[PDB]
Amino acid sequence: GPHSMRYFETAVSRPGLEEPRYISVGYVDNKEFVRFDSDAENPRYEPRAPWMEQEGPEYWERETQKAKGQEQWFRVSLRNLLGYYNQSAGGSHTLQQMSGCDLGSDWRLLRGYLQFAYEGRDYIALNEDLKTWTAADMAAQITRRKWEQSGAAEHYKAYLEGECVEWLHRYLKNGNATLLRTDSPKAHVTHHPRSKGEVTLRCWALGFYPADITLTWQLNGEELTQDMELVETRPAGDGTFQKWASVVVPLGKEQNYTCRVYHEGLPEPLTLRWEP
């Protein structure tokens, strides 16, 4: 499977005396491993994964120093964006960033990425070539000119192709067993009487990890994709996930319906029906 590292940043301006709140979250293969929050007692990058606890004090100090600088960068950028959009003071504004790299199974760099959004809308992004910018609106063109004239794309490409790939290699070794953990789903069917001589059959998948799962209902073979009701995958809060899928079936015909659960933790997909 492919690997990745991403940093998700957010700076939220606040009305009043308090400076903007700055949060930086790191992800390795979509799992949170580090977090910095400027609204903490002693703001610092903290481990969020067990395998990050292997890092020496020099690592945390250097990462914390970078974040303190970035909180100031996000502060000035929010000030510049307010002026570009000719916006009123005393408001609350959001600047977000996503950046990182994707690696192949052979640890080859597939792609690097960098994108920003202002007030929830795409603002500027680095193109796949990592040399040119795609600015979404009029104000973003002011940023593009400033960044082409400073050579910003060269500095991001150097990080995305270099340090990003190097640190991801190092994180992948340090936490191979942790990342490869699986919790298999426990499944059961519930019967919910309705009017018109019909029944809702609900297939539940509980306590599974990772989140990715497929729930299928079938009638004498052949999927029921059309009228099946699904719920979005939900965290149980203990590190595992939950999902259910349901179908409305006629009374007395419930044993013709079968539910299947597909998950990477399973030796084979689960097959189940309403047990009266």
Binding site: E63, F116, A152, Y159, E163, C164
Partner: peptide, 9 residues
């Protein structure tokens, strides 16, 4: 490890 932005928006 995180990256550092240089020129502002």
């Amino acid at each position: 490890a995180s990256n550092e932005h240089m020129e502002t928006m």
